Amino acid sequence: GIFAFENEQSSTVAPAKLYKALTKDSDEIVPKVIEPIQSVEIVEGNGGPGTIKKIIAIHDGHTSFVLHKLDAIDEANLTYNYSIIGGEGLDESLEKISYESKILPGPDGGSIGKINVKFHTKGDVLSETVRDQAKFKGLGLFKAIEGYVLAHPDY
Numbered sequence: 001g002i003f004a005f006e007n008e009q010s011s012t013v014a015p016a017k018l019y020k021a022l023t024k025d026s027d028e029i030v031p032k033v034i035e036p037i038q039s040v041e042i043v044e045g046n047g048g049p050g051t052i053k054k055i056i057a058i059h060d061g062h063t064s065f066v067l068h069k070l071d072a073i074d075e076a077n078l079t080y081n082y083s084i085i086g087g088e089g090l091d092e093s094l095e096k097i098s099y100e101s102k103i104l105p106g107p108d109g110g111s112i113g114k115i116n117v118k119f120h121t122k123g124d125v126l127s128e129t130v131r132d133q134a135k136f137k138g139l140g141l142f143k144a145i146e147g148y149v150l151a152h153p154d155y
Contacts, residue, residue: 003126004118007138011146013153015111019078019103021149022113022142029155030055033144038063048073052085064088071098078103091130095120097137113142 011018021029027040036057045051051070056063067086074080083098084090090097098118106112117138119126130137149155 001121001124001126002118003121003131004116005134005138006114006116008115009113009139009142009146010106010110011113011150012108012110013146013149014109015078015103015105017153018111018113018146018149019075019080021145021155022101022103023073023075023080025155026145027053029145029148030141033148036060040068045070055087057088059088066090091127091133093122093125093127093130095122101142113139113146115139115142 013021030040031037036059038056038058041054041056043052043054047070049070049072053068053070055066055068057065065087066084066089069083069085071081071083072079079100079102081098081100083096085096098120100116100118102114104112104114115138117134119130119134119137121127121130
């Protein structure tokens with residue numbers, strides 16, 4: 001199945017800066033904001049669509065990873081779509097989780113992060129364990145990065 005959810009988060013960060021942090025600079029910001037993440041490594045591709053990233057983490061004890069694929073990016077429209085396609089952290093019932101993001105202009109020179117998340121389930125049911133984690137999964141990454149940029153604009 002494919003269960004889509006939409007979420008929106010306002011931010012005081014200027015659209016282009018928030019977008020940059022979420023795209024171009026995420027590899028380097030993420031390790032600083034989510035401690036278990038040691039690094040984010042490009043294992044395929046040269047950065048545009050199709051690129052695969054191995055996010056190396058050590059969830060208490062041993063190193064593991066999660067696989068991320070860039071599905072599309074359009075900086076001119078401040079949009080970027082990526083998916084979580086493998087490794088630990090990806091529920092057993094999911095094929096992958098796809099995110100389609102767009103940063104829109106908000107009032108007062110701030111912005112709005114519209115995140116459409118799609119859970120591609122192996123069955124016809126979205127488990128309550130996942131529908132109850134569609135949160136951390138929905139806006140988690142976004143909030144972490146936005147908070148960082150918010151507190152470290154000159155990063």
